[PDB]
Amino acid sequence: AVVWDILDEVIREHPVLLNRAPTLHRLGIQAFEPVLIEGKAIQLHPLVCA
């Protein structure tokens, strides 16, 4: 579990890029600051999903 603590420490300010094929226009790739959830689905904010 110390690995989980380290993992929570590392990403605290580490943006990641989300991409949806096809990337029709440049909005198709965007940057987000992650939050860690159990499960296996990536969770988006609906507004940007539009």
């Binding site: 579990a1 989980w4 860690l36 159990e38």
Partner: protein, 232 residues
């Protein structure tokens, strides 16, 4: 043991002001945050005992839209100001106060007839503006101790239709809370990620600090429950 439950820590309080404050709890079991927040909001809104101003009488007034010269604002505006009057009485549950003034400018609660049993918390509050000299305002207002909230259409009755010309009615916002909100979020401990973390945002008039109000609400609910808990 099955009886185990993760009691929360009073993880923080953040006072934006004497009236405005936030209180946060972490962690709580799944679904406990919602029930506790909902129950507290209910009790604060509908059952908190308070002291409020309910009637006003003015000699030249028969109805809420009775025209009056000299005063800057309309009668309904002064009614709203009275509704906003922060007042607490420690003595009798029913008190009558009078205000009489002739002066250009604001009519603050500082000019009410003071009494040792009653504290106006915010004397700086303005009831109205009186536009001119040789113009006067004269009123009597009635303050009462009650529980919850009562609007005008609720208090009016045919059993109390025997009213004189000079009687007006004010909504008695006894419960001193001005706003209660709570929101629920996720928190993690012991690699568990199925937990409730609770945030409460609160505003109340200057009668009491919000912490005191929350403690009072908790005590009320516990005293309600007490007849059931056979445990120590």
């Amino acid at each position: 043991s099955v009886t185990e439950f993760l009691k929360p820590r009073l993880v923080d309080i953040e006072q934006v002001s004497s009236t405005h404050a936030k209180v946060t709890l972490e962690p709580l079991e799944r679904g406990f945050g919602h029930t506790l927040g909902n129950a507290l909001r209910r009790i604060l809104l509908s059952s908190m005992p308070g002291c409020a101003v309910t009637e006003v009488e003015i000699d030249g007034v028969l109805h809420e839209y009775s025209t009056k010269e000299g005063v800057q604002e309309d009668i309904l505006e002064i009614l709203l100001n009275l509704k906003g009057l922060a007042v607490r009485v420690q003595g009798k549950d029913e008190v009558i106060l009078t205000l009489n003034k002739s002066g250009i400018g604001p009519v603050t609660a500082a000019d009410i007839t003071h009494d040792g049993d009653v504290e106006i918390v915010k004397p700086q509050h303005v009831i109205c503006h009186l536009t001119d000299e040789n113009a006067s305002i004269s009123m009597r207002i009635k303050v009462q101790r009650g529980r919850g909230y009562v609007p005008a259409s609720t208090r009016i009755h045919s059993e109390e239709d025997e009213r004189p010309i000079g009687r007006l009615l004010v909504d008695a916002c006894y419960s001193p809370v001005e706003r209660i909100a709570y929101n629920v979020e996720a928190a993690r401990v012991e690699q568990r990620t199925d937990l409730d973390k609770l945030v409460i945002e609160m505003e109340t008039n200057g009668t009491i600090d919000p912490e005191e109000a929350i403690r009072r609400a908790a005590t009320i609910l516990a005293e309600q429950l007490e007849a059931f808990v056979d445990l120590r």
